[PDB]
Amino acid sequence: XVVXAX
Amino acid sequence: PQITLWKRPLVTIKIGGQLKEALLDTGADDTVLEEMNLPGRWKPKMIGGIGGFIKVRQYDQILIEICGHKAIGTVLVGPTPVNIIGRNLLTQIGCTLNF
Amino acid sequence: PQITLWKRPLVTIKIGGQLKEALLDTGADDTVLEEMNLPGRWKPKMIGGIGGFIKVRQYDQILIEICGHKAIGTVLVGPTPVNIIGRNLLTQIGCTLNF
Ligand SMILES: O=C(O)c1ccc2cc[nH]c2c1
């Protein structure tokens, strides 16, 4: 897996 | 604390007498939770991630405790697969990266 | 270094003999970089985040420098909007969160 935010 | 990164950096948070947990996320501009308990009126916001863009519910002036540290700021409610504390709140508790 | 979080924590990296820049992301389990060739054989992997999933190529045991600090580990390559250093490599350089 999990990669997180713009 | 001084938190290593061998596992996900999940911490206790408290909002409105609900205890939750959320990941301290330096790669997130914003704080995003899957739900909050009866939080009221909101405005729409779009955010992006690796997979595309999502519509979220923006709540301002939320009082939150993160690992016992009090902060105030914007919390988004949206379809994040893990609750995340982003830089908008990490800055408020004095969080840094160090190596 | 000590990195405050008032802006995105982008740093210089060196991979494949090339200088690039990447976001230090404590909310990323794994490292994902934009399309490049790397040595060795890859295997297909899926990763998720906000907005859904993406297909990546997984390369194992890759040398990377992160602000001059050497690490060796898994690097995923695919259509990410930003290069991301995740926990798999942050741990190798002794990066911690501090507040
Ligand atoms: O790079 C590729 O050709 C490729 C194709 C399919 C998948 C599925 C997960 N990763 C992939 C990479």
Q: Where residue C43 sits, what CATH number does that domain have? A: 2.40.70.10
Domain that holds residue C78: 1-99
Question: For chain A, how big is the Rg over CA atoms in Å?
Answer: 6
Contact C52 B48 (CB under 8 A): no
* Chain B adjacent subunits, 3+ CB pairs under 8 A: A, C
Q: Record the tokens describing residue C94, joined without a space.
A: 């002794």
Contact C21, C34 (CB under 8 A): no
Helix (H, G, I), strand (E, B) or coil at C87: helix
Q: Record the tokens describing residue C64, joined without a space.
A: 């990377």
Q: CB of C52 within 8 Å of any CB in chain A?
A: no
Closest atom, ligand 1, to C-alpha of C46: 9
How many domains, chain B?
Answer: 1
Active site residue B25: yes
Method: X-ray
Pairwise CA distance, residues B90 & B87, whole Å: 5
Contact B86 A5 (CB under 8 A): yes
Chain A nearest C-alpha distance from B18 (Å): 23
Contact C66, C3 (CB under 8 A): no
Q: Which residues of B touch C4 (CB under 8 A)?
A: 91, 96
CA C94 to chain centre: 15
